[PDB]
Amino acid sequence: FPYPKMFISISGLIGAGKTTLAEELAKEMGFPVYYEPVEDNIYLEDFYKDMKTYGFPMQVYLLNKRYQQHQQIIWSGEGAVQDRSIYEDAVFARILVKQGNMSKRDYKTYTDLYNNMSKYLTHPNFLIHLDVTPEESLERIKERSRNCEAGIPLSYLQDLYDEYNIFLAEISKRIPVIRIRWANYRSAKELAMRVYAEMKKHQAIVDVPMTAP
Amino acid sequence: MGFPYPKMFISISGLIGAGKTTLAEELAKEMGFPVYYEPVEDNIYLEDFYKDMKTYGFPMQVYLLNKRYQQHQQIIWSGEGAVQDRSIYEDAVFARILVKQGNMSKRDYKTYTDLYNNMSKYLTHPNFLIHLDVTPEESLERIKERSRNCEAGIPLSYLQDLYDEYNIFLAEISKRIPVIRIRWANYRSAKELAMRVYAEMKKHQAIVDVPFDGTMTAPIP
Ligand SMILES: Nc1ncnc2c1ncn2[C@H]1C[C@H](O)[C@@H](COP(=O)(O)OP(=O)(O)O)O1
Ligand SMILES: Nc1ncnc2c1ncn2[C@H]1C[C@H](O)[C@@H](COP(=O)(O)O)O1
């Protein structure tokens, strides 16, 4: 019987290593993996020069990409590991509003659009959050050395961190969430193996006292 | 200034006569959700089905799929979460025991599962499954206490088929979504059952922290 396919998303701060974990976890499980390559984001350079002007249009542009990716996932008829979830764009939007880089009117326009869109977007069975600090994220940004990210201050990554933690407390009411500390001491392969094992552990039927197996 | 996090959908599962609608109602009351269910009288095929399972089995599955579809459109239109007293997966559990018994052909079963798969994107998929665990013997006794005329001829073997198929279904579906399996034992009412179910749901939905490389960066509210 065509039981629904397994959809797994990774979340975490900039530079956390979401993409590496997605590839390794997708290997472990036998699933196709899906990325959004940063070079394809034609707004990103301008956004970092002027967040207030380019924030809202980039959010719409990124939502279009998430919509194409779901149609691709649905068409595949298989499970999937995604290196980013649809909820993370909303995280970025809320901090931009907080910082005065997005108007409250544009934010509401954006969330109405997201709400209208969601029915045709990917909703994960399982969310894996890579737990890293803002300082670790800043260091991973510096080591990667993307020119457009060279200007990001720590305060921006702290806002993002704070918003992610609020979001996780809410989203975990709806879907299983594994939050896994990764400071890059153990390997990405060990990380994926532990994520997989923790997923299997959490997916066991809860029996409440039976007669079963 | 909030965000439309996805809505929560809970389905109750269990054998004939297990008391799923009452558990659904009390759980929805405890959670502050609407509850949705299908009165048995609205199934205009059920009486013919029990007189002749082989003739009416397949058309009833299609008919019931239409009901699950309208019920999902209603839930989506509501813009709220929902507790439902039956999941869309259970009709297929019945279809498989009908094929095993020779009451539905392999070809008709394949037609049905193709239809379900084309349908599934416009149907309700639960975030959480609550399975009421009752034995075939307990189910037969609940059927007699309720005394639906169309159910009077149901033999124990039919309920044993159903019970076995449910256990297979629970093994697969629990790979995709959280499942709580709960026995009637010692609970005096659905309200008492519901309160334990709700407590277990909150416990199972806690974030799993894995201090893989080191201590978690901060506790989460
Ligand atoms: N909705 C959004 N709003 C603003 N910036 C976004 C955004 N979505 C992504 N970005 C930015 C943040 C980063 O500069 C880049 C994301 O790359 P990444 O998070 O570092 O992946 P990885 O962890 O695998 O290294 O794009
Ligand atoms: N898909 C399918 N095929 C055959 N018979 C079905 C199906 N769905 C429900 N039923 C029958 C089973 C019971 O007689 C009644 C539900 O009663 P309750 O006590 O609420 O479970 O309806």
Author numbering:
A (entry chain A): 26 to 234, 239 to 242
B (entry chain B): 24 to 244
Show passages lifted from the paper.
The lack of RNR makes G. intestinalis and other Giardia species completely dependent on salvaging deoxyribonucleosides from the surroundings to make the corresponding dNTPs. The reaction is catalyzed by deoxyribonucleoside kinases (dNKs), which is considered the rate-limiting phosphorylation step in dNTP synthesis. The enzyme was found to use deoxyadenosine as its main substrate and was consequently given the name deoxyadenosine kinase (dAK). Here, we report that G. intestinalis has a deoxyribonucleoside kinase with a 1000-fold higher catalytic efficiency (kcat/KM) for deoxyadenosine than the corresponding mammalian kinases and can thereby provide sufficient deoxyadenosine triphosphate levels for DNA synthesis despite the lack of de novo synthesis.
To structurally characterize the active site and investigate the substrate preference of G. intestinalis dAK, we solved the structure of full-length G. intestinalis dAK to 2.1 Å by macromolecular X-ray crystallography. The ASU contained two copies of G. intestinalis dAK, of which each subunit showed a similar fold to the homologous structure of M. mycoides dAK, as well as human dGK and dCK. However, when we superimposed the G. intestinalis dAK dimer contained in the ASU with the previously reported M. mycoides dAK dimer, we noticed that G. intestinalis dAK dimerizes through a different, not previously reported, interface (comparison of violet/cyan and orange dimers). Taken together, the convergence of X-ray crystallography and cryo-EM revealed that G. intestinalis dAK is a homotetramer, and that tetramerization is mediated by a combination of a novel dimerization interface and the canonical one also found in M. mycoides dAK. The N- and C-terminal extensions reached across the novel dimerization interface to interact with the neighboring subunit of the tetramer (half of the tetramer is shown). Thus, the extensions of the dAK N- and C-termini make multiple, specific interactions that appear to stabilize the novel dimerization interface that leads to homotetramerization. After crystallographic structure solution by molecular replacement, we identified unbiased Fo-Fc density that corresponds to ligands bound in the active sites of the crystallographic dimer. However, the number of phosphate groups differed in the two subunits: whereas a dADP, with a partial occupancy of 0.5 for the β-phosphate, could be modelled into active site I, the density for active site II unambiguously allowed for the placement of a dAMP. In G. intestinalis dAK, the adenine base is held in place by face-to-edge (F72) and face-to-face (F117) π-stacking, and hydrogen bonds between the adenine nitrogen N1, N3 and N10 and Q84, an H2O molecule and Q84 and D114, respectively. Finally, the α-phosphate forms hydrogen bonds with G40, K43, R109 via an H2O molecule, and R169.
